[PDB]
Amino acid sequence: NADDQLKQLSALEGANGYVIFNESGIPLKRHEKSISHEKAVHIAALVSDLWNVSKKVIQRDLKTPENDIEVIRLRTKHSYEYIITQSGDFTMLAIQLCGKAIEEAKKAAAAAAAAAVVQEENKEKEKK
C-alpha cells in the first residue's frame, strides 16, 4: 500500500524523485533514481532549515497572526522544481522537470539503450 505511492509519484510525468522527512530529520523513503540516504541526509537538513525558517518568519517577520506556509515551490535553472508539502509531522521534497527536460531525459535513456544494444552486439561478435 505505502510502496504503491512511491510507484505512483514516479508514474506522474515530470517527476524525478520524492524524499520524505520526519520531524527528527531522518529520511523515511527516497526515490531509487536519486541518491538514497546520502542525498536524503543532505536534502533533509536543507529543507528543515528552510521550512523552519520560513514557518517562523511568516508568523513573526510578516507580523501576520495564525498564518502558516502550506506549499513552497523553488524554480531554479534548467528543469529543476522542488515542491515541498508538509503533512502531519512529515514533510517531503518532490523534484519534477519541464517538458524540454523530460524530452532530454527520454533522449538520454534512448541513447543508453542504444549503447547497451551495441555492447550486446559486440559481445555476440566476440563469441562468434
Partner: protein
Amino acid sequence: IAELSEHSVNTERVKTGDRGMSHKEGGWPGNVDPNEAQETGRFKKRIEKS
C-alpha cells in the same frame, strides 16, 4: 644574614584534552547507530507503523 629557604609556586594550568569527532552522519536518535545498517533499517520500519 637571615637564613634563606627557596619555594617554587606555579599557577595551575587548566587541563587541555584533544578529542576528534565527525558530524558527517545525519542527525539520529542516541539509541540508534548511524553507521550500522540494522539499527537504521529497524527504526525506519517502526516509524511507518500513522
